[PDB]
Amino acid sequence: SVEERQSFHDKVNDVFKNLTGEAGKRWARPDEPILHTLNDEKEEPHIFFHNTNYRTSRKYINVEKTKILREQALECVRAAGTARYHKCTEVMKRLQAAVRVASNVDRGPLARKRDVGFIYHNNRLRELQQQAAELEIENPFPAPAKQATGGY
Amino acid sequence: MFLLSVFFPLLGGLVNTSPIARFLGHRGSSIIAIGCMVVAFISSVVIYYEVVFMGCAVSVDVFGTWFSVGTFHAGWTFNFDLLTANMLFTVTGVSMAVHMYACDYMRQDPHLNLFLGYLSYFTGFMCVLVAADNLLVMLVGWEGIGVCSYLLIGYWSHRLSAVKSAQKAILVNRVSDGLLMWGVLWVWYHLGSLEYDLLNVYSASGFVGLSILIGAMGKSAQILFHVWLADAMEGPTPVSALIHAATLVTAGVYLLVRLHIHDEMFVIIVGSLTAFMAGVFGATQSDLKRVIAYSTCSQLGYMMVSLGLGETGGEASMGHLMTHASFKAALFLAAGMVISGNGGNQHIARYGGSAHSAMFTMLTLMVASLSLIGWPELSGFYSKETILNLAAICADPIADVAHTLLLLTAMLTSAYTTKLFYQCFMVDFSGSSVTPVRNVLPILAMAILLLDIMLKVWVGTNLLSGMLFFLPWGVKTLPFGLMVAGILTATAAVGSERFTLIRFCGSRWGFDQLFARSPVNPIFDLGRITWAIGDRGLLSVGNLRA
Amino acid sequence: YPGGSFWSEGTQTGKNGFLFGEVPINGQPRKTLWWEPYWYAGFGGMGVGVYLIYHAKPLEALDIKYWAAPRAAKELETEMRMLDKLNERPDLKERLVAVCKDLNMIEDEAYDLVLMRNEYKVKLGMHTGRVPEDLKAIYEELEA
Amino acid sequence: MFISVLLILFALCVTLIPEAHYHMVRVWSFVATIIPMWVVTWMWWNFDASGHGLQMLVILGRSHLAFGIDGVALSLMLLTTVLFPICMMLLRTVAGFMTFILLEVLVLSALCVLDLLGFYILFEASLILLFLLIGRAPYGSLEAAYKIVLYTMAGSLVLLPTLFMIYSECGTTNVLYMTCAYNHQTVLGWGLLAVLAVKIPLMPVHLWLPEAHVAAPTAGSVLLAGVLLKLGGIGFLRFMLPVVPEFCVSVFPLVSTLCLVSFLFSTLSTLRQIDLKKIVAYSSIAHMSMVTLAIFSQSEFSAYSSSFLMIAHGLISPALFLIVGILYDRAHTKFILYFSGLGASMPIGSTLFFLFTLGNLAFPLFPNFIAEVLCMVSIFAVHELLAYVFCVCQVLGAAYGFWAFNRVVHGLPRGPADVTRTEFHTVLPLLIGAVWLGIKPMA
Amino acid sequence: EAKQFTPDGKYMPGIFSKAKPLDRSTQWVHKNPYIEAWYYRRDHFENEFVWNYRTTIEALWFLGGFTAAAYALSVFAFRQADRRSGYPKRQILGDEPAMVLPDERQFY
């Protein structure tokens, strides 16, 4: 109801008014988001700015994860030499998965979903091959690949 | 020693173009340039022996991170592996002799130290190109050699045709640079990194190999992009030697060999068509430098087909690049000496005899010409025969036509190279200027490249030399017969009466004339429409008279 | 060559042109233009200030990527062994793939779901019930 | 705030200096723009990059006019405070000093305002100053001044009722509460598109720029190209994208086709230009079209790449205007047919012209290269063809750039002598900024 | 052979002097009348616009034609991006009520 929404707004305003934090902690780098059942979180501005700060933190952390994994994968591949085809597939897979998470989470309203492994493409090729088998016509598409890159 | 192969020619260019050179003059700047190339060549020799023979690659973080926004991460990092060591040895060794030649060839130029600094910058950006471990530092090298090629082609700026040749090289390469940039975007988007060691592609989205192939066709001057290469003869002879041997034209082939993400049908068709086209183009030219330019285009076609054949074909492609640089630079330096001995004339109808040149210039032209035509047990014999035999056993039916085109091209090459020797020395004299050059510096510059030609026979480029791909004696010894056929035809000096074919080929199939009006004049006219009819017309809002 | 050799003296003394078109008057030192002290003070104090911003600010204060680099490393440490255990447990993997199907993800995106346990949508969806209740349990036995 | 009042009051004291003390007038007006550069550098020192998005806030009660700093505003403010003393070195009268001082106050306060009505009040209070600057009596053009003022007024008058519509809808024009309320986004989105598509030159409302940016003096051209176009971009990034995002998604095909046709048609027009200043003036439209499409992609790190392209353009194109201004000041023409062989007669000026030509064409070791790569990463992530259109048309930019350079720099040597110390030091901060931001921009 | 500086600096204007002083306008170009006329005409080329046959035809096929091509390409790219992101059909301007703005709390 309107009364319950109003009392919740008053509680949120009181909490964010009397808020403090010290000892090496930055406010606007919060540890946890504020969990809510609100229709349109922008109904409560303090919760919206808090979760905005948390989401900014997560995007930058995922970028950093991608860089650490890329350094590790470079070390593996350069040490392995010509044996890199069977030695460093797993670390390449983990780097590609981290890049996928760094791009596809909180992506914006317009960008398409990024597949670093050609994994959506080969999954679609599998499903289209299966559909063309039941359709009992020739497949106009390529057959799906087992792996497309050095990772996936 | 590893960073001395890349930094130090750039340092020589920085010294010879800055106001430090105001205190050295021509005499001091020549010393600075030659020493700054000798040090880089010594460093590249050490790198070559460590990486090629003992197999220990070296990765250097040079200047930290360049730029890193989101997951797009470009770093100032080098990696010195087998291909990089091969390219560095080739580039620095050719550029040292070209610097030693240019310090005497351009002696009477008024701005000599500026020319030497431009040569050093061009060499250094080539070293940056091949030493890079990711795509963006490679693009630094790509556009750096493009800019230095513009500065060196249009060096004699008071001549309008030289200025227009430099602008043409920039624009033709800018089309392929755009396609290469879009391909880099595809590669990074669907693999997640820019470093070469993390770019292992089994099955990609087609636009990747096509757009990277177009970007390589621009720099390596393949079909429908070769038009800038012939006009780049407006620059001085050291510029042409360094463009056609070690820098610029070998960069696209290096990029395709490094990445190995092409689709072989396009690569084989483009390479074989380029080889046949440049073979028939060079057979019908009379400008001494234009024949050598078209032979460069033809050999780049051979290397393109080879890297289409496979991984072994990619190794053979790199091997032919490495052996081609030495005798091509030697051919250009000998041609420059012949031109200077004949009063600046470049037409082969006004040569003849053995008075306008030194004994060493004639020996250099003879030995480099014999390596180019695949004379047995010289340097080009091993690499060219390897590519030809690999093309004779490919299981792709497309490679059947490509092999025939390559054999016809081999006969044409032995025709026009023998014609270049025959017109220059064997016929009676038909010039009027005899001023033969016998200075120490250009003779030593030629002797170094002949030593590298001997070195390629004695020590191979890779392990393919001596491997036997099992072919019958008829298939194996046919290119020798095609070489002999070219030699016999060119020394007989015979011609045909089909003058319309002669003038269709000699005018180089009309590519420049057709390009002068199929994109160029329409671009000008569409600009007229967008300005006059749009900005001044349809969108213009007038005044209210009162 | 002058003197008959490459190794002789040079042949030019004096000004080789005039820098900025400035010619010395009566041998006097060049008079300082009106803007020069203020230009050098202003732009030099901007350049030194930009240098000190890049080289003397605390790293977390200079760029947020230095705040997140140590926090990504520990999360990656506790995620690499989760991914190691997932490669050894087929029952946990098939339960993760079931949760991936519920979240409109494909089977190859199983590694992605482990790597996004701290995301805003996953925490809020565990709170709201859009996320399946089993995913928290799978995270619990993959961390254990 | 107290500092800003002190800086304004120190700047306004130029009028009270008696005109017979020429040296004092020059030194005072130059120092009055040097000081805000130091203050904005200090603001960059004070900024916490791991803290909140909005820092150093101040709000002046119930008068609107609320202020705050984010990254885009801070980079643009640093660029403006660099550009204004160079403008001070190119003027000779107290009227010019006072017009540029008032313009600096208005630009600096507009770049960091957080109120839409405050943005409206602060920005187009510069209209009459631009009219007097462009239509100056002996050497300006009144037609150009009328065009720029009337186009800007038309766009602002479209915005003003929609501004007041959201103000009556929610109760405030503060952007922090406008972004959290429910508003009719189509109407306000059309008003904001109307202002910012005139400020950024987007076709068809772009015809004021070729007249105004050429008829202006060299200082006016430096200001108009390097600063005032970017107020449309910061308008997009600060006000329109946060407050009307549903509109910003729904208008994307229209904004996309406007950006594509602006890029292509303005590049095609630049090739037929015969005036050097008109050549430099057209090239800015294509760069701003790439900026606008990168802002509207909203895809990877779109605010970052688009702000970086705004900074790279704001460094490179004022230097080209400075070189054209030197040629015009000491040869009295801007016509290409009167210039040839400038390499032999101005070697330093031609070297600077070549370096800034390469920078304008987004070659590496210049900040435009990094900028265009990241902008095309942001564009590519929506669709590959929208990136391909900009990629394949790179020959068209290089054609006009190298054709203009080759026509004026090579050939028979005719034209003025090389640059003075003052002209070299007008150019020099832009070159140092370009070398830094193109080699090691970040740490 | 003018003298615009004293031996200790001190610029002199030479207002009443016979010798011509070197100054800012020393290298101003001598104007060619036909070049000035051509640049004036190109500066005022909007007076030469006329709705004849060629103007109308080229303004239709190139200006309107490429504008329509770019609008079609933009809509194509928008729809393909929404399909490759797991979205339904989305509401552009004049497209009936539909989905705009995906929710971050939702898995697509």
Ligand SMILES: CCCCCCCCCCCCCCCCCC(=O)O[C@@H](COC(=O)CCCCCCCCCCCCCCC)COP(=O)(O)OCC[N+](C)(C)C
């Ligand atoms: C939208 C982000 C802003 C980026 C805009 C592009 C800037 C252009 C140049 C790129 C330089 C990158 C600098 C990175 C480190 C500097 C500090 C920093 O972190 O940047 C600041 C802002 O950076 C700046 O202001 C950079 C100034 C660049 C302007 C340079 C041009 C002016 C110089 C002209 C030439 C002077 C030469 C004088 C010498 C003679 C904040 O940005 P973010 O890290 O994104 O903010 C974090 C977000 N949050 C708080 C929510 C967590």
Ligand SMILES: CCCCCCCCCCCCCCCCCCCC(=O)O[C@H](COC(=O)CCCCCCCCCCCCCC)COP(=O)(O)OCCN
């Ligand atoms: C108009 C165009 C002109 C073109 C010019 C040539 C083409 C240039 C193309 C690339 C330009 C890149 C220049 C980068 C400048 C410095 C960037 C790094 C700044 C910095 O603090 O880094 C440290 C500086 O180290 C060092 O710098 C090394 C320490 C000193 C020892 C060597 C001294 C240099 C000798 C160079 C000779 C001449 C070479 C000419 C290029 C290295 O450490 P890091 O923080 O990155 O840590 C990682 C590894 N430790």
